[PDB]
């Protein structure tokens, strides 16, 4: 059946599979186009970039990025690692272009979407790369508002230092489509002042929090873990 997302990841119950090769990330060519406040979240659209290797049948191309956060800095990601929650979550969305005619079509099939999850952890450290996104937020303060990403930004710089990953067959966060998750438990670090700009964005009221509360891992659903 359908496996709703997000979930809690029981690290101890995760099964280790030798068929996982190392994941291969090529965001070197991916430049961002427009940034959008959807009324529910920050979305950053990308032209170019793809992922390959690991358990993937073929290359999946980068479509876009979503940003999530909570009311308080200490608890605002979607997914959880042993009931621990990070400050927020980046969701990098990819789809199966090799196979399908479009993203629109890709959503209709369980091999269509692959969403990489990068955790945001608030420390006492201004993240210079993440700041580029923060600098845009004035332009998209209004709801249903798009604007040109007005700076140089390499998405490669938001990658964790350690790219070991959990993976499971879930859904998109809004349940619109099945999707396969790749979740890096090593987070990237940001400052509290950076995450606070997001809470000043207007909603469809302000977007003070936008994460989805977790779901039961289904009996048949397995969560796999690669040792890098």
């Amino acid at each position, epitope marked *: 059946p359908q496996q709703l997302s997000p979930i809690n990841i029981e690290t101890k119950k995760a099964i280790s599979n030798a068929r996982l090769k190392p994941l291969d990330i090529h965001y070197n060519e991916s430049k961002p186009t*427009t940034i959008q406040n959807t009324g529910k979240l920050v979305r950053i659209n990308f032209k170019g970039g793809y992922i390959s290797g690991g358990f993937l049948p073929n290359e999946y191309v980068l479509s876009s990025l979503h940003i999530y956060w909570g009311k308080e800095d200490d608890y605002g990601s979607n997914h959880l690692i042993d009931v621990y929650k990070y400050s927020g979550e980046i969701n990098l969305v990819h789809w199966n272009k090799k196979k399908y005619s479009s*993203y629109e079509e890709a959503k209709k099939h369980d091999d269509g979407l692959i969403i990489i999850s990068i955790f945001l952890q608030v420390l006492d450290h201004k993240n210079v790369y993440f700041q580029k996104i923060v600098n845009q937020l004035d332009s998209i303060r209004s709801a249903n508002t798009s604007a040109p990403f007005d700076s140089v930004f390499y998405l490669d710089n938001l990658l964790p230092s350690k790219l070991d990953y959990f993976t499971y067959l879930g859904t998109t966060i809004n349940h619109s489509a099945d999707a396969v998750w790749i979740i890096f438990p090593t987070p990237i670090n940001i400052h509290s002042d950076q995450l606070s700009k997001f809470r000043t964005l207007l909603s469809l009221h302000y977007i003070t929090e936008n994460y989805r509360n977790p779901y039961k891992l289904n009996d048949d659903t397995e969560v796999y873990y690669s040792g890098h």
Partner: antibody
């Protein structure tokens, strides 16, 4: 640069469904929102709804709710607008329009749908 | 929700200044109001969102906050005589419209 080419004017009997189209060019369709607006002859503008073409997610004005369906074809770069049960009063000019700073930035030329028996 | 523009219709000559105004029922959150021009038998045109749209000349200028906003055209012209609309965003309700005719 940006061009919005809407379908030609239509004449429809009562209780019929028309499907007005919008053909988009000169920008990335999915990177921006897409709005639809009504203008009855002589009277002013009235916002009908919008669509995110990337995911095809829509929100309509409650006034037009139920009797309207906005869609987006990412393959043909074509937004559509489908009126459900047509009435005399639905006689109007219907504009598709590209969003750019929260609002309809670049407008199309409209489509004069006319309703009569 | 509801916007009402002033006046019903605004009569003036070329060369002088035009002061259009739109007033609202509830606070326009974070002051997100926009002004559209519409000439007859034509598509509307985004003038301002007090932010200038590219293509729109130095003549025009918007301002305001809360529930009182004002479009100002310093130094009128013949092409500027049109129907004008105020839109509230950030929903999407339109002003009932202000017709700018010629003072005879």
């Amino acid at each position: 640069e940006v061009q919005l080419v809407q379908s030609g004017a239509e004449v429809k009997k009562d209780l019929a469904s028309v499907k007005v189209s919008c053909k988009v060019s000169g920008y990335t369709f999915t990177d921006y929102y897409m709005h639809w607006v009504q203008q009855a002859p002589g009277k002013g503008l009235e916002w009908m709804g919008l669509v995110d073409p990337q995911e095809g997610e829509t929100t309509y004005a409650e006034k037009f709710q139920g009797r309207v369906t906005i869609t987006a074809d990412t393959s043909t770069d074509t937004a559509y607008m489908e009126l459900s049960s047509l009435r005399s009063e639905d006689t109007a000019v219907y504009y598709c329009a590209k969003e750019s700073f929260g609002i309809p930035h670049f407008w199309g030329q409209g489509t004069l749908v006319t309703v009569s028996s | 929700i509801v916007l009402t523009q002033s006046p019903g219709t605004l009569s003036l000559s070329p060369g002088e200044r035009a002061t259009l105004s739109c007033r609202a029922s509830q606070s326009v959150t974070s002051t997100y109001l926009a002004w559209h021009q519409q000439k007859p038998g034509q598509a509307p045109r985004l003038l301002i969102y007090s932010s200038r749209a590219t293509g729109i000349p130095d003549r025009f200028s918007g301002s305001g906050s809360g529930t009182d906003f004002t479009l100002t055209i310093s130094r009128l012209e013949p092409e500027d005589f049109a129907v004008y609309y105020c839109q509230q965003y950030g929903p999407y309700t339109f002003g009932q419209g202000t017709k700018v005719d010629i003072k005879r």
